[model samples]
Target: GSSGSSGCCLPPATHRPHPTSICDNFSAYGWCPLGPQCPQSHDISGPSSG
Candidate 1:
């Protein structure tokens, strides 16, 4: 049943899913830098040439 509510479904993940070149924090930042376990990156610029 539904109620006076928001989206019928809720997100299972707190962050956006990665694009092809975008990466998981694990493989990207093996040592876990820059904060908590983000586990995801929004970058699609490949992994180099910053």
Candidate 2:
């Protein structure tokens, strides 16, 4: 279960827009005020761990 746990598969998004809303707080400080409830995108193509 360690080696190649899962095959990398890409799910294509066709005829639809990516549901990405600009996160207000996270955009500037890499933080989200709404936490999990926030429906906005919290990452600018960056990994945020904190």
Candidate 3:
């Protein structure tokens, strides 16, 4: 006979629920190369010229 199953079979996926931004103070900065400098707001833009 088989035994009864327990709770979660596997551990939950590890992910970052929320991220922080270092360049949040910089208003002139349009892009942030570093992951830490991500922007809190989202702005829609058109296609690039290149």
TM-score of each: 0.17, 0.41, 0.17
Candidate 2 vs candidate 3, lDDT winner: 2
Cα lDDT, model 3, residue 7: 68
**Residue pair clashes in candidate 3:** none
Give the Å error, residue 36, model 2.
2.2
| Model 2, span 1-50: residue lDDT tens | 45854667655655555655778787777778798788887666665689
Q: Name the regions of candidate 2 deviating beyond 4 angstroms.
A: 1-19, 45-50
For model 3, how does the per-residue alpha-carbon lDDT over 1-50 read when each residue is reduced to its tens digit? Answer: 87777765556676546535334333244554544445554333333655
Ranking the candidates on TM-score from highest down gives: 2, 3, 1
Q: What pairs collide in candidate 1? A: none
Q: Which candidate number would show the highest TM-score if scored against the true structure?
A: 2
Q: Give the Å shift of residue 48 in candidate 2.
A: 16
Against the reference, the lDDT scores of all candidates come to 0.52, 0.72, 0.46
Q: Residue 48 of candidate 3: its Cα lDDT?
A: 60
Q: Return the TM-score for candidate 3, rounded to 2 decimals.
A: 0.17
Report residue 29 deviation for candidate 2 (angstroms). Answer: 0.9
